Amino acid sequence: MDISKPVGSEITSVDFGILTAKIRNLSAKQITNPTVLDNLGHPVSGGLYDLALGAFLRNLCSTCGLDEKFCPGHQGHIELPVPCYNPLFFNQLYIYLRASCLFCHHFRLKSVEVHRYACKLRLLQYGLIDESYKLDEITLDISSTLLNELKSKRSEYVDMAIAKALSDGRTTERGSFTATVNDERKKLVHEFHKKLLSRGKCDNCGMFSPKFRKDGFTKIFETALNEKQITNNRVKGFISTYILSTEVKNILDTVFRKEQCVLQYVFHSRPNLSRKLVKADSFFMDVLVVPPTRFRLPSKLGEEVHENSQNQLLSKVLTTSLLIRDLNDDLSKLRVIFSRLMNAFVTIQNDVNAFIDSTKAQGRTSGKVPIPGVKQALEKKEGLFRKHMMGKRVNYAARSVISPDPNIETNEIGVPPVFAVKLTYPEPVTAYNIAELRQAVINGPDKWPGATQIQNEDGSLVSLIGMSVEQRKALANQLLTPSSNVSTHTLNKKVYRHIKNRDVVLMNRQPTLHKASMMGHKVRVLPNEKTLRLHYANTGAYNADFDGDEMNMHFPQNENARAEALNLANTDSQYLTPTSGSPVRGLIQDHISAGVWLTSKDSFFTREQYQQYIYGCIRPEDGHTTRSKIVTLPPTIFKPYPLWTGKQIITTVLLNVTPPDMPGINLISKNKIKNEYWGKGSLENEVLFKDGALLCGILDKSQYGASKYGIVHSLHEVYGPEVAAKVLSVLGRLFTNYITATAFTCGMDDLRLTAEGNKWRTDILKTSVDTGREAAAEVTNLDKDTPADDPELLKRLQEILRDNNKSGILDAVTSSKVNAITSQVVSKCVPDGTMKKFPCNSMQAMALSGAKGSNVNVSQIMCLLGQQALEGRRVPVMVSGKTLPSFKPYETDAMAGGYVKGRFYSGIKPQEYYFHCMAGREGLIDTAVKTSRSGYLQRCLTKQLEGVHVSYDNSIRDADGTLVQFMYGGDAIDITKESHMTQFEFCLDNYYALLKKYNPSALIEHLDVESALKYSKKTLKYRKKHSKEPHYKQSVKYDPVLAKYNPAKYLGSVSENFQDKLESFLDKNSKGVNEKKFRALMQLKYMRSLINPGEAVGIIASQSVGEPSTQMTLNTFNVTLGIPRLREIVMTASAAIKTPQMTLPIWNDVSDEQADTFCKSISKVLLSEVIDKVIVTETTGTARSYVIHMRFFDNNEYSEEYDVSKEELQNVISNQFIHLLEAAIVKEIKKQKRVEANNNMNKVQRDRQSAIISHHRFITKYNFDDESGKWCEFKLELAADTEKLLMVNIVEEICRKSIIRQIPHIDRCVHPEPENGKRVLVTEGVNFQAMWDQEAFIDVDGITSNDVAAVLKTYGVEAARNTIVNEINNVFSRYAISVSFRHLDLIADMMTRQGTYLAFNRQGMETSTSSFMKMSYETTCQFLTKAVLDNEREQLDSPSARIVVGKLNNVGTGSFDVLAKVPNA
Amino acid sequence: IFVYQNNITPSAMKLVPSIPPATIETFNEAALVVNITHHELVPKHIRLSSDEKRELLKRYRLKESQLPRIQRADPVALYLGLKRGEVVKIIRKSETSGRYASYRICM
Amino acid sequence: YQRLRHMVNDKFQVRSTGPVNSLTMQPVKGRKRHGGIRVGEMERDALIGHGTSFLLQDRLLNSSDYTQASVCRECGSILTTQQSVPRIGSISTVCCRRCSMRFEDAKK
Whether A972-1092 and A396-422+500-574 are alike in CATH topology: the answer is no
Contact indicator for A390, A1440 with CB cutoff of 8 Å: yes
Output the known binding site of A for Mg(2+): 545, 547, 549
Is the CB of residue A488 less than 8 Å from the CB of residue A458? Answer: yes
Secondary structure tally for chain B: helices H, strands E:
2, 6
> For residues A745 and A1328, what is the distance between their CA atoms, to the nearest angstrom?
65
Domain A972-1092 belongs to what topology?
Tetracycline Repressor; domain 2 (1.10.357)
End-to-end CA distance of chain C: 97
A713: three-class secondary structure by DSSP: helix
Is residue A1249 within 8 Å of residue A1261, measured between CB atoms?
yes
Instruction: Write phi, then psi, for A881 (nearest 5 degrees).
Output: 80, 20
Amino acid (1-letter code) at residue A1325: G
How far is A645 from A98, CA to CA, in rounded Å?
94
Q: Which residues of A are annotated as a binding site for Zn(2+)?
A: 61, 64, 71, 74, 101, 104, 202, 205
Closest CA to A18 of A285, A361, A358: A285
- Bridge-based pairing of strands A304-305 and A693-696 is unpaired
CA–CA–CA angle A1401, C50, A540 (5° rounding)? 95
How many CB atoms within 10 Å of residue A318? 23
Instruction: Indicate if the alpha-carbon torsion angle A626, A630, A631, A637 is positive or negative.
Output: positive
At residue A1192, the 3 state secondary structure works out as strand
| DSSP conformational letter for A736 | H
CB A151, CB A113: distance < 8 Å: no
Q: Which amino acid is at A1219?
A: H
State how far the Cα of A272 lies from the Cα of A122, in Å rounded to an integer. Answer: 11
List % helix, strand, coil for chain C (3-state, nearest 5): 20, 15, 65
**CA A706 to each of CA A570, A700, A709, A717, A727: distance values in angstroms, whole numbers, following the listed order:** 18, 10, 10, 15, 13
Q: Which chain B residue's Cα is nearest to A959?
A: B66
- Cβ atoms of A738 and A596 within 8 Å: the answer is no
How far apart are alpha carbons A1258 and A172 in whole angstroms? 78
Instruction: Please list, residue by residue across A549-569, b when 16 or more beta carbons sit within 10 angstroms of its beta carbon and e when fewer do.
Output: ebbbbbbbbbebbbbbbbebb
Q: What residue type is A174 in one-letter code? A: R
Mutate to test the interface with B, among A966, A977, A1379 (most CBs of B within 10 A): A966
In angstroms, the CA A1039 to CA A1046 distance is 14
From residue A1280, alpha-carbon distances to A359, A1232, A1291 in Å are 61, 14, 21
Rounded to a whole number of angstroms, the distance from the CA of C39 to the nearest CA of chain A is: 6
| HSE of A1338, CA atoms in CB hemisphere, 13 A | 27
Q: Distance (Å, rounded) from C-alpha A1377 to C-alpha A1070?
A: 37
**Which of the four CATH numbers 3.40.50.2300, 3.40.50.300, 3.40.50.360, 2.40.40.20 does domain A396-422+500-574 have?**
2.40.40.20
The CA-CA-CA angle for residues A516, A519, A521, to 5°, reads: 145
**Strand residues in A86-182 grouped as ranges (E):** none
Q: What is the dihedral of CA A1067, A1069, A1073, A1077, to 10 degrees?
A: -30
| C-beta neighbour count of A1435 within 10 angstroms | 17
- How far apart CA A631 and CA A52 sit, in angstroms, is 79
CA distance A494 to A500: 16
Instruction: HSE, CB side, 13 Å, CA atoms: give it for residue A243.
Output: 21
**Got the DSSP string for A385-448?**
HIIIIISEEESSEEEEEEEE-SSS-TTEEEE-HHHHTT-EEEEEP-SSSHHHHHHHHHHTTTSS
Answer whether A730's CB lies under 8 Å from A720's CB.
no
C-alpha R_g of chain A: 42
The dihedral of CA A676, A677, A681, A687: what is its sign?
A: negative
- Which letter does DSSP use for residue A88 in this model? S
List of chain A residues whose C-beta atoms are within 8 Å of the C-beta of residue B68: 963-964, 1389, 1392-1393, 1395
DSSP state of C62: I
A1201: left (phi over 0), alpha (psi -120 to 50) or beta: alpha
How far apart, in whole angstroms, are the C-alpha atoms of residue A630 and residue A73?
A: 69
Name the minimum distance, in Å, from the CA of A533 to any CA of chain B: 41
Q: What's A450-475 look like in SS3?
A: CEEEEECCCCCEEECCCCCHHHHHHH
Please, how many CA atoms are within 13 Å of residue A471, restricted to the half-sphere of its CB?
10
Is CATH 3.30.56.10 what the domain over A423-499 is classified as, yes or no? Answer: no
Q: Which pairs with CB-CB distance under 8 Å and at least 24 residues apart come from C68-72?
A: C68/A5, C68/A7, C69/A72, C70/C94, C71/A9, C71/A11, C72/C96, C72/C99
CA distance A1453 to A565: 12
Which residues of A are annotated as part of the binding site? 61, 64, 71, 74, 101, 104, 202, 205, 545, 547, 549
Residue C58 zone, left/alpha/beta (φ > 0; ψ -120 to 50; rest): alpha
List Cβ<8 Å contacts ≥24 apart for A1206-1212.
Answer: A1206/A1265, A1206/A1266, A1206/A1268, A1206/A1269, A1208/A1300, A1208/A1301, A1209/A1167, A1209/A1170, A1209/A1264, A1209/A1269, A1209/A1272, A1209/A1300, A1210/A1264, A1212/A1167, A1212/A1298, A1212/A1299, A1212/A1300
With b for 16 or more beta-carbon neighbours within 10 A and e for fewer, the A1334-1350 pattern comes to beebbbbbebbbbbbbb
Decide: B94 and A970 in contact? Cβ < 8 Å: yes
Which fold is adopted by the domain A575-745? Enzyme I; Chain A, domain 2 (1.10.274)
Phi first, then psi: what are they for A1188, rounded to 5°? -95, 115
Cβ-contact A265, A118 below 8 angstroms: yes
Interface with chain B: mutation pick from A978, A1032, A1142, highest number of B CBs within 10 Å? A1032
C26 touches chain A (CB under 8 A): yes
| Cα–Cα nearest to A967, from B52, B99, B85 | B99
Which residues, including other chains, have CB under 8 Å from residue A10's CB and lie 6 or more apart? Answer: A1447
How far is residue A105's CA from residue A1071's CA, in Å, rounded to a whole number?
91
Residue A1416: closest CA among A1430, A1402, A1429: A1402
CATH fold for domain A746-909:
Topoisomerase I; Chain A, domain 4 (1.10.132)
Distance CA A1434, CA A1436 (A): 6
Q: Shortest Cα distance from A19 to chain B (angstroms)?
A: 33
A344-354 burial, b at 16+ Cβ within 10 Å, e below that, comes to bbebbbbbbbb
d(CA A138, CA A144): 17
* Cα dihedral A987/A989/A991/A997 (nearest 10): -60
Give B107 to chain A, closest Cα distance, Å: 8
CB-side neighbour CA atoms (13 Å) of A84: 26
> For residues A518 and C47, what is the distance between their CA atoms, to the nearest angstrom?
8
Task: State the virtual CA torsion across A606, A609, A614, A619 in degrees, nearest 10.
Answer: 140
Give counts: helices (H), strands (E), chain A: 53, 40
Best probe of the A interface among B29, B66, B106, by most A CBs < 10 A, is B66
Residues in B 37-96 with any Cβ partner in A closer than 8 A = 37-46, 59-71, 74-77, 83-85, 89-96
Picking from C12, C9, C28, C60, the residue whose alpha carbon sits closest to that of residue A415 is C12
Q: Which helix (H) or strand (E) holds B104?
A: strand B98-106
- C-alpha–C-alpha distance, residues A1139 and A1136, integer Å: 9
Contact A1432, A10 (CB under 8 A): no
Q: How many CB pairs under 8 A join A and C?
A: 234
For A1153, residues 6+ apart whose C-beta sits below 8 A from its C-beta are none
Q: How far apart are CA A1102 and CA A940, in angstroms?
A: 9
Q: Is A1039 left (phi over 0), alpha (psi -120 to 50) or beta?
A: beta
- DSSP secondary structure string, A1104-1156? HHHTTTSS----------HHHHHHHHTSTT-SS-SS-EEEEEB-SSS-HHHHH
Closest Cα in chain A, distance from residue C6 (Å): 10
Given a contact cutoff of 8 angstroms between Cβ atoms, the answer to whether C82 and C95 are in contact is yes
The span from the CA of B72 to the CA of A1395, in Å, is: 9
